[PDB]
Design a protein around this ligand. Structure first.
Ligand code: HEM
Length: 183
């Protein structure tokens, strides 16, 4: 993934647990030689998955739990590190934002030429619920999606209830979530 993602990971760990913890995680992930991540540079996805795994071990959290926190963090990170207006432009409610997400990544993809963005499709079941289809070229990121949804809930001051109903890993087509939301 682009370096931006790996910077966000470093920033979250550093902010929440301090530099020493970050250094131990970076070492454990096999990344000691990397002085810094370059935000607009493409990295092997392996870099990210190794950080997740190292973080899980060092912190003693399940990786899924950690990815949820990271997904929630991304919503704040992007808004603060150069993508605040882009985020704002994607809307002011959760369902509108999710409808706009493919278009938001299309916009990101203008600047990040090698982007492999997720694809999100909403099927609205009422004015307060939807089925969310999450399609990706990557494995294992559903828990990050769960966190992202909670970050968006906070962003829009909306209570979000999210349950995963289909699993990419289990050999189903793609991840699906049922979501209820209320002001
Ligand atoms: C301005 C805000 C955002 C920016 C600039 C941004 C940018 C990016 C970038 C650079 C990647 C890495 C993909 C790659 O390197 O090929 C990515 C991946 C991803 N993004 Fe966005 N993103 C933003 C907001 C969001 C939000 C709000 C969501 C909420 C669902 C989201 C969902 C995801 C997911 C789930 C991935 C994992 C990649 C995958 O599933 O294959 N992003 N994004």
């Amino acid at each position: 993934m682009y370096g931006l993602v790996n910077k966000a990971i470093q920033d979250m760990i550093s902010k929440h647990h301090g530099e020493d913890t970050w250094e131990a995680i970076k070492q454990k992930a096999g990344l000691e030689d990397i002085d810094f991540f370059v935000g607009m540079e493409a990295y092997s996805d392996d870099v990210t998955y190794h950080l997740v795994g190292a973080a899980s071990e060092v912190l003693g959290k399940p990786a899924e739990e950690w990815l949820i926190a990271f997904g929630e963090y991304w919503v704040t990170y992007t808004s603060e590190e150069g993508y605040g207006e882009l985020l704002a432009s994607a809307g002011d409610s959760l369902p509108e934002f999710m409808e706009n997400l493919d278009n938001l990544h299309a916009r990101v993809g203008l600047s990040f030429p090698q982007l492999r963005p997720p694809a999100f499709e909403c099927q609205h079941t009422s004015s307060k619920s939807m089925e969310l289809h999450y399609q990706s070229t990557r494995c294992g990121l559903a828990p990050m999606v769960l966190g992202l949804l909670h970050g968006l809930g906070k962003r829009f001051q909306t209570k979000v209830e999210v349950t995963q109903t289909a699993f990419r890993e289990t050999g189903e087509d793609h991840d699906i979530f049922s979501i209820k939301y209320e002001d």
